Amino acid sequence: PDSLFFTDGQRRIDFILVYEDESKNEKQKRKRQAYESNLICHGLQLEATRSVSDDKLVFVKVHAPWEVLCYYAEIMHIKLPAPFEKSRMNDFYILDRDSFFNPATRSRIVYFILSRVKYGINRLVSSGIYKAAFPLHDCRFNYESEDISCPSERYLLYREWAHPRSIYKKQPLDLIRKYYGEKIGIYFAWLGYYTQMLLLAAVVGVACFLYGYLDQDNCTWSKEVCDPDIGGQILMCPQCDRLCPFWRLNITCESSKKLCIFDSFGTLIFAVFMGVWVTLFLEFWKRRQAELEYEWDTVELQQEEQARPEYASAVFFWILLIIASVIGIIVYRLSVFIVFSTLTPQMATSITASIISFIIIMILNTIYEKVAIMITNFELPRTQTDYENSLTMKMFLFQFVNYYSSCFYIAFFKGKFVGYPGDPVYLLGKYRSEECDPGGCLLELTTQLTIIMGGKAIWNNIQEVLLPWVMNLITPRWEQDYHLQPMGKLGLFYEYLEMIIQFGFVTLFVASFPLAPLLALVNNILEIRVDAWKLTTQFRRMVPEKAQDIGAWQPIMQGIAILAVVTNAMIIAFTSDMIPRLVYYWSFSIPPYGDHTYYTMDGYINNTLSVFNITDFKNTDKENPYIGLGNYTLCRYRDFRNPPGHPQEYKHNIYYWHVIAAKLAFIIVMEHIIYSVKFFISYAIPDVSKITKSKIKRE
Amino acid sequence: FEEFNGKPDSLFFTDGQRRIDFILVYEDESKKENNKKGTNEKQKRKRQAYESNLICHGLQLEATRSVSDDKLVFVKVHAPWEVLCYYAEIMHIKLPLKFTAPFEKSRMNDFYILDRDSFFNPATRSRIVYFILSRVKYQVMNNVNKFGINRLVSSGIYKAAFPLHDCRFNYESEDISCPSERYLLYREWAHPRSIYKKQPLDLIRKYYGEKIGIYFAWLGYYTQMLLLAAVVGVACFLYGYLDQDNCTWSKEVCDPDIGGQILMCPQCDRLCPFWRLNITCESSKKLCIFDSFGTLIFAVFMGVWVTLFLEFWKRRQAELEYEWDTVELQQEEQARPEYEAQLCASAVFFWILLIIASVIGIIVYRLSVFIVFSTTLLTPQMATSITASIISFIIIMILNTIYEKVAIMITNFELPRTQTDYENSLTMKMFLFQFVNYYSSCFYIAFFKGKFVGYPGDPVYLLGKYRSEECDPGGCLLELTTQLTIIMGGKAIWNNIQEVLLPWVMNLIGRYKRVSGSEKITPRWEQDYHLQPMGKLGLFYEYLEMIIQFGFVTLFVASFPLAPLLALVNNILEIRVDAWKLTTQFRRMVPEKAQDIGAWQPIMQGIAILAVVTNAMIIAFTSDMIPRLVYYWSFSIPPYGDHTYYTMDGYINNTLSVFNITDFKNTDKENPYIGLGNYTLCRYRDFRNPPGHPQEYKHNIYYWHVIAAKLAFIIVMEHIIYSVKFFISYAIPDVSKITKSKI
Ligand SMILES: N#Cc1c(C(F)(F)F)cc(O)n2c1nc1ccccc12
Ligand SMILES: *[C@@H]1O[C@H](CO)[C@@H](O)[C@H](O)[C@H]1NC(C)=O
Ligand SMILES: *[C@@H]1O[C@H](CO)[C@@H](O)[C@H](O)[C@H]1NC(C)=O
Ligand SMILES: [Ca+2]
């Protein structure tokens, strides 16, 4: 009756050893028989059952006798999930002398016993000695189990927390760590509290975004860019080599109006706020980690060493990092090139380039993970924890480069090192440096970032789980569980990697796009339930494991924060064009330099653009693109340089150095202020949380 | 009990087989009691309760009448083996060998035990009996328990309580069996005749405990690292000295054909007339010597050396912790609230007082300079700077004691939970007060002096009659160096003199209170009672002074390469000054244990972190290195300059600005400059457009280029030094290989 115990026997299962009869290399069959005989002889009860669907396949069952299992568990440091000790049976009440131990704990202990066995459960599966070994779920999730004794914990947890109907329901970590293990429990607690604080980040970001959005009318520079009498008269220079004429500047009202949203004081305030939000996230997560460590069964002894089933090139890895970064940059550049070489149209072309870049990123991710795995295996880590740590580092670095190259390029290395029209820059020869429009490449950067984040989260979640669930929205236990498949040894690793990449996206380039926390919040709200459903539905049961913290990812979080402060400062200083506007408003709109009687932004664009003379087309005396293109003689370009007819011909003028001094002063002041606040908040742990230590140490 | 038996240096009981551990001193009833005799009787009853409880707990006692004054009674103490072992077991004290488990009586055969007292060193016995005295209780009234030896001296029932020094420091004990550790320490450790021999930290630990041993080990290691730093700094200073004919700007200012022709512009109102830059040819030489690229190299080397010092101190700390086997007692630590006990307002008051202290320091330095300048009428300028620095240092020394007292009051008004909390609050408050007090003037000179003064036409008067001070063309680097060296050297000298003298003069006054020609033999306890009490704070002030010295060494090291040398000589003297005052003019401090220096280590970390930014800002703003580099790289070229190749020629002439004298606007004081009536334009240290021009006196391209270069240099140095410090910290294993093997 699909019972969780042996036939006509009150003994509960802990693994299924499925073996296919060789009758449909006899030394392999002899080894299998010897291993089974030894397993039986060690004092483990076993039953043999033939698959109902196919008689050829026979399943080998195992159990755990109470006395021997308890003795072998007490042999080493295993405590109660009052303390357990074979000298104190009557001292502490036992709910039942046959089922007191948590089924997860019994599965863990018997797994340890099988691990100690030598002719290798996974080795036997690889060699075909025993095809697989995996425990059984309490009940098939479709409907609650008939058996009264079985609590049907799987169905109960599914309905309570894995079904989307509980979307607003708070996290029930109780059954999670009672059934799956400490790893999944801590992972889900971390995910949930991350979402909790992403809510605060998203509300603050939305406040800043509305601050920017409601000031459209008073965005003077955009208004001037649009007014034909002001914007149109500015006949800009061509920004390419062979396929661009003199173009007016008022063709970019849509771009300027969109940019005035993400490039106002709201963005700066939001970056400042995220500066302290990141440290609050880290510190409060440390505190929740400590609280979980105290509350849950995390006082277990730490194992020293273990064997591995399978058992200087460091610079060689860095070369691969460099190649990957260059490949990403090349991919983005060629994508934009091909899309250009054919209101909405320019934005649609940018979106198409971003989509192609994301497609290439996703295609290359598989190659990156494969190469990382092989190179890590070539080193032959002594144990498995070291192997996981090294894989974490290498995989995270490939991901980091592959996902952030394009972003870093657009933010910093695009339009920042191009010369004046007379003497442009060709670093490698015939490879001109692209130049941003007067507003800058901030809008393109934010479009790229939002497209990448969306595409990743959406496509990944859909293709990995949601197909059965979206179409829905539109035999014995051992056989059924066998029909399922495992998650391997890096499923939790992949979930952590996805979450870390999402965190990096939301924190690093947060100045450009103040709405990133909201998208990450929605993604996490989806992802927690998606992962719950997938784990509890489509994947076999897993042996529980104990972990205190998330693992090797916390250092990545700290590094990402320390990098994000600098990245945000650099973005606001260079990528955006707010510092030039501030400097103009406060210094160059006055009689000493300007002509206005009071600080006003009137005439900013006009008075900021530098003029160029076609007659000085080249210092190299080569072919010019300004040939023909009408009877025009002078064109204005995006740079701070002295006009023709000045003693210094096309050299940086006073305004350039004023603006660069302002940029560096902003970088210094913001960096120092944010780091000081971060250090104060890290030093004020005792002065904020008088509650926690007193509560813990009083009782 | 009886009186003095006749053996003056005997450290045993009258029988001669028992050893003394403390001397309990009180005043007998034979004194002329006043006020209320009921209070006197209560003190008596408390005293008999004390003695009764002590005898009950198993401590043998005997009293003795002071030989000179009958009104003083000395009460000895002795710890038999049973009680000593009991309290050692409950303290988890680890016992010497030559892996390990706590100490139990059952295993005497596994330790090198010969006799009861001989096995236990006097320091541990004194600590054990001190704990016994602190914990024991006598009586309860008002439904509140009462106890504590410190409360006894607080109430005046007991004048003091202290262990006994082994013997006279300058003579061996007449007992052939006495180790006379004090004499050995005096002959080899103290008594600066041994100014060079390595101090025997093992004997210091054995005698004065780990609290003093760790301090002196830290001092010695600090001296060694300062020797390394001073050698490097001397190398850099010597390199700067051997190249003076090559400082082209120094030559230009010195040469009368170039510097003399430049008619500089008055800084003053009617106190100074015009003047020729050539007068400033010596300062220029000195600046060459202390602004050189040697200064930059030394600043980077200091950024590295502060780290190396911190991590090597951590390594030595781990070594000491292993060797001195303090782990068990470190694990078992328990403290009780101050017997005085038996918030945000205070914090804001402390911060306001700290701000006031900073402002007072700035104002006193400015007033000293003002009065010295007004009194005016080997360089006379140098003499004026030295006089102003001397006055400022005097006032700083005066205000130091006031700040100490106010910190004491602020911390006492609050209710510290336990001794450690009070100690840490005092550490923080004292360090902040002395930081502000000592460094306000230096920071003012470095950053806020001569940095926000306008052109001569429109000077910056703060609020009226207060014209902002401004520097010479080279900069105030030399003024800062003079002020810093004067402050540091004067503090070293005065501190050493005061430390050596004040306990000594107090002892001589105490003797003079008995002008009668006694000249006789007194027992050990009586003559040890005449030393100073060594107030319970302990090495707090020693650590404070060394932390101030370290702050001076690191914070401003971009303006004084010789600071490590001064610090080295000061520390070589300080080792022996502290050793002498500790061995010869103080009662035995009760031994204890400490993991580290204390609350000061976070202070040292903070100083190291702030040093990078302070040095970067010094080199960027107070020094004129960056303007020189900018001129050599971007203004000695045809686009702006005239030289075909990069060179420092014409630097001074081209750098300065010009001002039309008749272009002095404003109706107040219409005749500040035209009085002389000799020339019509003046040159001042500033980067501004010359007269005429569309932008007459607004900053020119040179100013903004130099500002951008300064900020870029600040960013680059900060980031590179921080990264190198991070990598140095990561690379260092923090524990030596020998320690790893043994541990
Ligand atoms: N020249 C020179 C100086 C020399 C040396 F002789 F070595 F060159 C040494 C020295 O201590 N100082 C020098 N100039 C100083 C100005 C202020 C304070 C100290 C000063
Ligand atoms: C720009 O202004 C000119 C004024 O002549 C005009 O004709 C054009 O429609 C405006 N808009 C764009 C996008 O060029
Ligand atoms: C000061 O300048 C005068 C005038 O050129 C010159 O004669 C004298 O030698 C100079 N003195 C110094 C010390 O430079
Ligand atoms: Ca001292």
Residue numbers in the entry:
A (entry chain A): 59 to 82, 91 to 147, 185 to 222, 232 to 423, 457 to 487, 503 to 634, 647 to 871
B (entry chain B): 52 to 149, 183 to 426, 455 to 489, 503 to 868
What do the authors report?
The dual functions of TMEM16F as Ca2+-activated ion channel and lipid scramblase raise intriguing questions regarding their molecular basis. TMEM16 proteins form dimers; each subunit comprises 10 transmembrane helices (TMs) and contains its own ion conduction pore surrounded by TM3-TM7. Ca2+-dependent activation involves direct binding of Ca2+ ions to two contiguous Ca2+-binding sites formed by TM6-TM8. Here, we report evidence for a lipid scrambling pathway along a groove harboring a lipid trail outside the ion permeation pore.
Here too we identified 3 distinct classes that closely resemble the 3 states observed in our drug-free sample. However, lipid densities along the membrane-facing surface of each monomer are absent. Instead, in all three classes we found a strong oval-shaped density in the same hydrophobic groove identified as the drug binding site in our niclosamide-supplemented dataset. Our structures show that both modulators replace the lipids found in this pocket in our drug-free sample. With both modulators directly contacting the extracellular-proximal end of TM6, our mutagenesis studies suggest that residues on this helix are critical for drug binding. We thus speculate that, by binding to the upper part of TM6, these modulators may simultaneously lock the ion conduction pore as well as the gating element in a closed configuration. The inhibitory effect of both antagonists was significantly decreased by all the mutations, confirming that these residues are important for binding these inhibitors.
